[PDB]
Amino acid sequence: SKFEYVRDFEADDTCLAHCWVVVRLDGRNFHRFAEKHNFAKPNDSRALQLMTKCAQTVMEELEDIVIAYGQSDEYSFVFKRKTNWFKRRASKFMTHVASQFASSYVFYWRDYFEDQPLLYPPGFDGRVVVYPSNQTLKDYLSWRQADCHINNLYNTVFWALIQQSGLTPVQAQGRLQGTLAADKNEILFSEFNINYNNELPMYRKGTVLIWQKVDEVMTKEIEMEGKKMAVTRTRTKPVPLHCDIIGDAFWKEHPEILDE
Amino acid sequence: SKFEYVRDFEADDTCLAHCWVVVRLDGRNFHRFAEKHNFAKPNDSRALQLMTKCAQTVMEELEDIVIAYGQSDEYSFVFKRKTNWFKRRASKFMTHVASQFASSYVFYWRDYFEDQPLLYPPGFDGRVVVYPSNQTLKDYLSWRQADCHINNLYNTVFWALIQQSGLTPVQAQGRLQGTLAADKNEILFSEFNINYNNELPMYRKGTVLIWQKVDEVMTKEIKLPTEMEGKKMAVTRTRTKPVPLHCDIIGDAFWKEHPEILDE
Amino acid sequence: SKFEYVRDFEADDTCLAHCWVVVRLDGRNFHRFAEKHNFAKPNDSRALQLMTKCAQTVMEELEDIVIAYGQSDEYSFVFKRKTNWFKRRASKFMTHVASQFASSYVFYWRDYFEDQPLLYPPGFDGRVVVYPSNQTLKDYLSWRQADCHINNLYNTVFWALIQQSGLTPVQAQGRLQGTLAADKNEILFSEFNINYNNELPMYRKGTVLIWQKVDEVMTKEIEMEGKKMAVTRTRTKPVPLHCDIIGDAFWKEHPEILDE
Amino acid sequence: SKFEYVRDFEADDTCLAHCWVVVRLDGRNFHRFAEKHNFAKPNDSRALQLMTKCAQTVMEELEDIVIAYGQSDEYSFVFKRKTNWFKRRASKFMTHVASQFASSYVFYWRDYFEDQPLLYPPGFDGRVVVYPSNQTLKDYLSWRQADCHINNLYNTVFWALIQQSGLTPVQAQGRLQGTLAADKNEILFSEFNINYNNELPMYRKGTVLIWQKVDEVMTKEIKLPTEMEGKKMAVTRTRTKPVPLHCDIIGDAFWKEHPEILDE
């Protein structure tokens, strides 16, 4: 062809063998995206459930994904440590995840945001991180849940002072500046009479996705239709679970994830 | 946190400085996607125009993209050689392009496929290639257009034998197996009386996207000075947009016409 | 300076954290080097002991090297998995090892090759390989010893047919072409009456280097001097051991190497 | 083997094609090495000439090295931009240079340090840097010579205050702290009556190594034809060697004089 020599410029990005490959996604400028689409503070179920639906779609479409954790405007996908899906090329792991998720986001938008229209197609930021041991993999996942915890605890009391007390964002910020976790829990209990541990598990722990056995699916109808249909499905599908993954309780319960 | 040590495992993928960064996208399993959505053969305008709309969206949303070429189920995006958009990290260039494009694809689907419904959200394959000189960059782009040419010439006569002559895919394949470009051009002219050079430029050359100054003119009112200046005067509000162009980019004609792309 | 912008072109080559970093060295064109310096076939003690002395020098001079294995014209150096010696930059691991070894090679040449002069300064080929688990690290090391075994078994009978039987290299090659390990062991026992298992352990298993406690060193004098001197040394020094490292016997005996 | 799977863990470090590959070497802890071997201050010819001999050895032994610059305890080696010596693997460029140099250093030590014995085998630090254009390559090289200049100017007056004036290192440091190049040149001229520009070029500009055609002529005998051709005739046996040159490489004068280095 005389122009095919340009293929030799492509660099190799094979991920180290026998290691866990993790792809983390983050909504690009979602702060702006949440404002323009009237997101609920401190948490929006519509948004969080949509993210999970996209993540589920990424798991069924791509291969070798064992566990997936997502919180707020992000979602991590862990590929099997002995995978060889696309010769373990990093670029392939990032882009297939990032595009399938983004595609899914616009597709299933009507399923969660019925009344709120989608003004513009959003973008997503993705990366690949490689972990050699199962301990480092677990520690990464806990780091993600810990981050979910600290941020939700902060945001719940932060928007409480704004929506109920009527304080401005700058005032609510200084009021909570330098406060500890015990303090933030106390303020929610005394000034608003709200117990944090009684808040939804989805907002406190985030969502976790793992493969479990399934027999059939009864989908509800959503124009005057509201009856369940008989739809054939795969023998196994990724199911949402909002539990603690920092403790060993989760890994003892599901040992097939690391010992495959 | 005692868990933040996991950040040190992230590898650095900074692209060599002073080099062109090109991100190429390819629809994953689009052969299946074309069948399930009844794509026109050998070319579908609905599909190609949608791809361009997504590419345009990637160009307005992201930064420092100077030229973008897309053919069939792919699209390449060239970032400025002196860019520093995301500290030049490869992962950032790939994923932002790949997700914005994919997002756009489902979003603007009704604008091109009015009657045909979208059955499922598609996926895309992306990569990054780095080119040190302008020659290597040009050669990559021509390689893409050449590929467009060879494939369209083949597909036009390939589906001609199938839809008009009634031959099976396996028969049309053997008939064209070992034939040259001159031969394929001859068969189209004799058996179907169709001139290839008279086929749409979009199918033969593909689409190219460059920046162009597009101005919009509207009448504006005058509030000062008071001295007989309460009349109307025209005012041009110019905004730079990426405009489609289906021309040859292998020849120097294109680069002479638009020298700002390489000499920025 | 207006010329310091060239520093930004330097690429980062940090090795994945919590992984074993292994630097492997190979003599460049040592086939030519062995001919020009009259090396003994199928093995030369002078050469092998020199390589070990260089390796020992690399271990005392550099830091965090736990085990080092060398066979023939090569030597591997394993750095601690939790090291942070030079911010874990690959380039630093390769070059410091490669240069210190090469330096040492010319320096200590008179200590092993007394009568044979060094005609020219040799070169060495080096690389870095990263291993995530202890199993992959062990498997690499065994792969190196296995290679030592197969090659020595072949070379011993190969040079036997040449030096005793008088066969040409091309003839000895065809004679052993397609033969198994049991066959090569049989030919050595019948045609030359030489038992392979009674050959030096250094030639069969190669050399292994690990850190062990030391009190003092008695160096022998080598002009009419042949008396031992009292020289102060470090409390720990890398000692040669020619044993099997493929089996678990070695790792049970020395568990401090992997569990540090 | 059941153990060969460990080969798949080796990472690829191919340097971007069509780019200059530069390997820079630096003596590890040479500050200590200079003290223990009684190095002359502010400059030692024995040391600098040895470094050059090692660099020359690296150039003859390895392949595709076009220019090499070394100053003080370092030496840079530039490989051809279109090379394919070891499939352009970075690890190969670093280690072969680093070991050959180190080998050479101990080998040729007696050629320069006749009276001073080598107490211990030294080590060297090496790295690889990739440059896409010829401008960036030139700028790197000048950066190296500039560094040579600034440091020698400083060290000459720094050791002058110590060896002639008798000032302590800490005192000489404060005396020159905040001074400019013009100032340092003035102090050398007034207090010690020494003109910097009259100092050896090797210390001020450093050493540069380029390829040069060196021919050797010897008389050859003639055995044919028989017709009165049994006489003597001169015969030039030319062999290309890397020759030391202590000149300015920051200016264009050097590149005009030797254009084959960049336009190969």
PDB file of C-alpha atoms in Angstrom, chain A residues 64-227:
ATOM      1  CA  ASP A  64     -14.565 -11.725  32.214  1.00  0.00           C
ATOM      2  CA  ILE A  65     -15.847  -9.078  34.594  1.00  0.00           C
ATOM      3  CA  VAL A  66     -16.252 -10.591  38.083  1.00  0.00           C
ATOM      4  CA  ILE A  67     -17.204  -7.657  40.316  1.00  0.00           C
ATOM      5  CA  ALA A  68     -18.217  -4.042  39.728  1.00  0.00           C
ATOM      6  CA  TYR A  69     -18.578  -1.240  42.256  1.00  0.00           C
ATOM      7  CA  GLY A  70     -20.059   2.154  41.616  1.00  0.00           C
ATOM      8  CA  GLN A  71     -20.706   5.185  43.802  1.00  0.00           C
ATOM      9  CA  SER A  72     -21.974   8.639  42.888  1.00  0.00           C
ATOM     10  CA  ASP A  73     -20.770   9.536  39.373  1.00  0.00           C
ATOM     11  CA  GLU A  74     -18.341   6.585  38.983  1.00  0.00           C
ATOM     12  CA  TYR A  75     -18.132   2.828  38.493  1.00  0.00           C
ATOM     13  CA  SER A  76     -15.213   0.386  38.680  1.00  0.00           C
ATOM     14  CA  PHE A  77     -15.048  -2.902  36.719  1.00  0.00           C
ATOM     15  CA  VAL A  78     -12.756  -5.735  37.742  1.00  0.00           C
ATOM     16  CA  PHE A  79     -11.643  -8.180  35.040  1.00  0.00           C
ATOM     17  CA  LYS A  80     -10.430 -11.699  35.867  1.00  0.00           C
ATOM     18  CA  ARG A  81      -6.781 -11.914  36.774  1.00  0.00           C
ATOM     19  CA  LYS A  82      -6.151 -14.739  34.295  1.00  0.00           C
ATOM     20  CA  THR A  83      -8.108 -13.099  31.473  1.00  0.00           C
ATOM     21  CA  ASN A  84      -6.932 -12.890  27.896  1.00  0.00           C
ATOM     22  CA  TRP A  85      -9.955 -11.108  26.456  1.00  0.00           C
ATOM     23  CA  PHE A  86      -8.198  -8.769  24.057  1.00  0.00           C
ATOM     24  CA  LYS A  87      -4.684 -10.063  24.570  1.00  0.00           C
ATOM     25  CA  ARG A  88      -4.917  -7.985  27.739  1.00  0.00           C
ATOM     26  CA  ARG A  89      -4.442  -4.700  25.896  1.00  0.00           C
ATOM     27  CA  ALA A  90      -5.224  -1.748  28.167  1.00  0.00           C
ATOM     28  CA  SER A  91      -6.687   0.394  25.381  1.00  0.00           C
ATOM     29  CA  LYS A  92      -9.302  -2.271  24.651  1.00  0.00           C
ATOM     30  CA  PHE A  93     -10.386  -2.544  28.290  1.00  0.00           C
ATOM     31  CA  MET A  94     -10.837   1.234  28.657  1.00  0.00           C
ATOM     32  CA  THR A  95     -12.648   2.076  25.470  1.00  0.00           C
ATOM     33  CA  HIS A  96     -15.064  -0.838  25.358  1.00  0.00           C
ATOM     34  CA  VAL A  97     -16.157  -0.124  28.888  1.00  0.00           C
ATOM     35  CA  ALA A  98     -16.337   3.652  28.385  1.00  0.00           C
ATOM     36  CA  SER A  99     -18.338   3.466  25.151  1.00  0.00           C
ATOM     37  CA  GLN A 100     -20.777   0.711  26.183  1.00  0.00           C
ATOM     38  CA  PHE A 101     -21.522   2.576  29.417  1.00  0.00           C
ATOM     39  CA  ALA A 102     -22.024   5.907  27.631  1.00  0.00           C
ATOM     40  CA  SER A 103     -24.241   4.258  25.008  1.00  0.00           C
ATOM     41  CA  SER A 104     -26.300   2.636  27.724  1.00  0.00           C
ATOM     42  CA  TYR A 105     -26.645   5.897  29.634  1.00  0.00           C
ATOM     43  CA  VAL A 106     -28.586   7.643  26.852  1.00  0.00           C
ATOM     44  CA  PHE A 107     -30.449   4.484  25.898  1.00  0.00           C
ATOM     45  CA  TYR A 108     -31.933   3.684  29.307  1.00  0.00           C
ATOM     46  CA  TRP A 109     -32.447   7.315  30.337  1.00  0.00           C
ATOM     47  CA  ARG A 110     -36.233   7.120  29.921  1.00  0.00           C
ATOM     48  CA  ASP A 111     -36.364   4.116  32.280  1.00  0.00           C
ATOM     49  CA  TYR A 112     -35.277   6.219  35.248  1.00  0.00           C
ATOM     50  CA  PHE A 113     -35.865   9.856  34.306  1.00  0.00           C
ATOM     51  CA  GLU A 114     -39.458   9.707  33.041  1.00  0.00           C
ATOM     52  CA  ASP A 115     -40.349  13.356  33.417  1.00  0.00           C
ATOM     53  CA  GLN A 116     -36.882  14.909  33.155  1.00  0.00           C
ATOM     54  CA  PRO A 117     -35.615  15.176  29.551  1.00  0.00           C
ATOM     55  CA  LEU A 118     -31.976  14.585  28.593  1.00  0.00           C
ATOM     56  CA  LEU A 119     -30.634  17.914  27.341  1.00  0.00           C
ATOM     57  CA  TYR A 120     -27.301  16.734  25.954  1.00  0.00           C
ATOM     58  CA  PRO A 121     -25.234  13.502  25.587  1.00  0.00           C
ATOM     59  CA  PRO A 122     -22.693  13.299  28.458  1.00  0.00           C
ATOM     60  CA  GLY A 123     -19.075  12.200  28.410  1.00  0.00           C
ATOM     61  CA  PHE A 124     -17.076   9.878  30.612  1.00  0.00           C
ATOM     62  CA  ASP A 125     -13.505   9.712  31.878  1.00  0.00           C
ATOM     63  CA  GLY A 126     -11.899   6.261  32.056  1.00  0.00           C
ATOM     64  CA  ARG A 127      -8.634   4.703  33.214  1.00  0.00           C
ATOM     65  CA  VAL A 128      -6.955   1.361  33.824  1.00  0.00           C
ATOM     66  CA  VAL A 129      -5.188   0.345  37.007  1.00  0.00           C
ATOM     67  CA  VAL A 130      -3.398  -2.973  37.471  1.00  0.00           C
ATOM     68  CA  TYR A 131      -3.282  -4.853  40.815  1.00  0.00           C
ATOM     69  CA  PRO A 132      -0.932  -7.836  41.418  1.00  0.00           C
ATOM     70  CA  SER A 133      -2.435  -9.354  44.541  1.00  0.00           C
ATOM     71  CA  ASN A 134      -5.928  -9.947  45.885  1.00  0.00           C
ATOM     72  CA  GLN A 135      -5.165  -7.778  48.923  1.00  0.00           C
ATOM     73  CA  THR A 136      -4.324  -4.743  46.814  1.00  0.00           C
ATOM     74  CA  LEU A 137      -7.514  -5.369  44.810  1.00  0.00           C
ATOM     75  CA  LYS A 138      -9.646  -5.533  47.952  1.00  0.00           C
ATOM     76  CA  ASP A 139      -7.988  -2.388  49.353  1.00  0.00           C
ATOM     77  CA  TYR A 140      -8.804  -0.484  46.180  1.00  0.00           C
ATOM     78  CA  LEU A 141     -12.481  -1.500  46.397  1.00  0.00           C
ATOM     79  CA  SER A 142     -12.683  -0.515  50.074  1.00  0.00           C
ATOM     80  CA  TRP A 143     -11.006   2.780  49.264  1.00  0.00           C
ATOM     81  CA  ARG A 144     -13.907   3.374  46.866  1.00  0.00           C
ATOM     82  CA  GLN A 145     -16.566   2.529  49.439  1.00  0.00           C
ATOM     83  CA  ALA A 146     -14.800   4.501  52.143  1.00  0.00           C
ATOM     84  CA  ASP A 147     -14.869   7.461  49.765  1.00  0.00           C
ATOM     85  CA  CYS A 148     -18.580   6.825  49.241  1.00  0.00           C
ATOM     86  CA  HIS A 149     -19.141   6.840  52.987  1.00  0.00           C
ATOM     87  CA  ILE A 150     -17.193   9.987  53.845  1.00  0.00           C
ATOM     88  CA  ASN A 151     -18.829  11.910  50.996  1.00  0.00           C
ATOM     89  CA  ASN A 152     -22.392  10.865  51.701  1.00  0.00           C
ATOM     90  CA  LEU A 153     -22.067  11.601  55.443  1.00  0.00           C
ATOM     91  CA  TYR A 154     -20.752  15.043  54.525  1.00  0.00           C
ATOM     92  CA  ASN A 155     -23.331  15.722  51.813  1.00  0.00           C
ATOM     93  CA  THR A 156     -26.306  14.638  53.892  1.00  0.00           C
ATOM     94  CA  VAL A 157     -25.596  17.128  56.665  1.00  0.00           C
ATOM     95  CA  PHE A 158     -24.345  19.684  54.126  1.00  0.00           C
ATOM     96  CA  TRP A 159     -27.624  19.806  52.231  1.00  0.00           C
ATOM     97  CA  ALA A 160     -29.565  19.525  55.481  1.00  0.00           C
ATOM     98  CA  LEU A 161     -28.207  22.891  56.639  1.00  0.00           C
ATOM     99  CA  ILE A 162     -29.104  24.303  53.237  1.00  0.00           C
ATOM    100  CA  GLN A 163     -32.591  22.924  52.627  1.00  0.00           C
ATOM    101  CA  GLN A 164     -33.949  22.905  56.197  1.00  0.00           C
ATOM    102  CA  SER A 165     -31.905  25.492  58.098  1.00  0.00           C
ATOM    103  CA  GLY A 166     -31.725  27.833  55.107  1.00  0.00           C
ATOM    104  CA  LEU A 167     -27.957  28.366  55.318  1.00  0.00           C
ATOM    105  CA  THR A 168     -25.935  29.306  52.255  1.00  0.00           C
ATOM    106  CA  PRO A 169     -23.434  26.836  50.765  1.00  0.00           C
ATOM    107  CA  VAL A 170     -20.529  28.963  51.983  1.00  0.00           C
ATOM    108  CA  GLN A 171     -21.992  29.046  55.507  1.00  0.00           C
ATOM    109  CA  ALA A 172     -22.726  25.320  55.624  1.00  0.00           C
ATOM    110  CA  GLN A 173     -19.150  24.718  54.488  1.00  0.00           C
ATOM    111  CA  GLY A 174     -17.539  26.685  57.275  1.00  0.00           C
ATOM    112  CA  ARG A 175     -19.883  25.157  59.840  1.00  0.00           C
ATOM    113  CA  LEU A 176     -18.664  21.648  58.894  1.00  0.00           C
ATOM    114  CA  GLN A 177     -15.061  22.693  58.318  1.00  0.00           C
ATOM    115  CA  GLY A 178     -12.864  20.749  60.727  1.00  0.00           C
ATOM    116  CA  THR A 179     -15.633  18.524  62.048  1.00  0.00           C
ATOM    117  CA  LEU A 180     -15.261  14.778  62.506  1.00  0.00           C
ATOM    118  CA  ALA A 181     -17.511  11.843  61.563  1.00  0.00           C
ATOM    119  CA  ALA A 182     -18.943  11.638  65.082  1.00  0.00           C
ATOM    120  CA  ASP A 183     -19.748  15.354  64.976  1.00  0.00           C
ATOM    121  CA  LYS A 184     -21.560  15.163  61.642  1.00  0.00           C
ATOM    122  CA  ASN A 185     -23.567  12.212  62.960  1.00  0.00           C
ATOM    123  CA  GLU A 186     -24.503  14.199  66.085  1.00  0.00           C
ATOM    124  CA  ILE A 187     -25.649  17.321  64.181  1.00  0.00           C
ATOM    125  CA  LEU A 188     -27.963  15.216  62.008  1.00  0.00           C
ATOM    126  CA  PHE A 189     -29.473  13.629  65.108  1.00  0.00           C
ATOM    127  CA  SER A 190     -29.938  16.828  67.137  1.00  0.00           C
ATOM    128  CA  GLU A 191     -30.745  19.599  64.651  1.00  0.00           C
ATOM    129  CA  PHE A 192     -32.741  17.560  62.143  1.00  0.00           C
ATOM    130  CA  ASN A 193     -33.567  14.439  64.127  1.00  0.00           C
ATOM    131  CA  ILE A 194     -32.317  12.149  61.344  1.00  0.00           C
ATOM    132  CA  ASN A 195     -30.423   8.939  61.983  1.00  0.00           C
ATOM    133  CA  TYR A 196     -27.729   8.317  59.377  1.00  0.00           C
ATOM    134  CA  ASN A 197     -27.717   4.535  59.759  1.00  0.00           C
ATOM    135  CA  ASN A 198     -31.402   4.538  58.773  1.00  0.00           C
ATOM    136  CA  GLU A 199     -30.662   6.151  55.389  1.00  0.00           C
ATOM    137  CA  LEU A 200     -30.835   3.967  52.293  1.00  0.00           C
ATOM    138  CA  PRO A 201     -27.979   1.399  51.997  1.00  0.00           C
ATOM    139  CA  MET A 202     -27.503   2.500  48.373  1.00  0.00           C
ATOM    140  CA  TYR A 203     -26.461   5.985  49.479  1.00  0.00           C
ATOM    141  CA  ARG A 204     -24.291   4.806  52.376  1.00  0.00           C
ATOM    142  CA  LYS A 205     -22.562   1.740  50.957  1.00  0.00           C
ATOM    143  CA  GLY A 206     -22.973   2.248  47.193  1.00  0.00           C
ATOM    144  CA  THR A 207     -23.840  -0.506  44.732  1.00  0.00           C
ATOM    145  CA  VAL A 208     -21.966  -3.769  44.188  1.00  0.00           C
ATOM    146  CA  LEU A 209     -22.549  -6.056  41.235  1.00  0.00           C
ATOM    147  CA  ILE A 210     -21.829  -9.786  41.095  1.00  0.00           C
ATOM    148  CA  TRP A 211     -22.975 -12.739  38.919  1.00  0.00           C
ATOM    149  CA  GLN A 212     -25.687 -14.980  40.406  1.00  0.00           C
ATOM    150  CA  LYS A 213     -27.985 -17.707  38.999  1.00  0.00           C
ATOM    151  CA  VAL A 214     -31.305 -16.628  37.405  1.00  0.00           C
ATOM    152  CA  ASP A 215     -34.263 -18.664  36.052  1.00  0.00           C
ATOM    153  CA  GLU A 216     -36.646 -16.242  34.258  1.00  0.00           C
ATOM    154  CA  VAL A 217     -37.629 -12.559  34.294  1.00  0.00           C
ATOM    155  CA  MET A 218     -41.023 -10.956  34.975  1.00  0.00           C
ATOM    156  CA  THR A 219     -40.910  -7.433  33.515  1.00  0.00           C
ATOM    157  CA  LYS A 220     -43.622  -4.932  34.510  1.00  0.00           C
ATOM    158  CA  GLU A 221     -45.355  -2.858  31.863  1.00  0.00           C
ATOM    159  CA  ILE A 222     -45.053   0.938  31.832  1.00  0.00           C
ATOM    160  CA  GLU A 223     -51.312   3.727  27.208  1.00  0.00           C
ATOM    161  CA  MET A 224     -53.024   1.442  29.706  1.00  0.00           C
ATOM    162  CA  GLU A 225     -50.674  -1.455  30.483  1.00  0.00           C
ATOM    163  CA  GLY A 226     -49.329  -2.653  33.833  1.00  0.00           C
ATOM    164  CA  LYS A 227     -49.072  -6.441  33.575  1.00  0.00           C
TER     165      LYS A 227
END
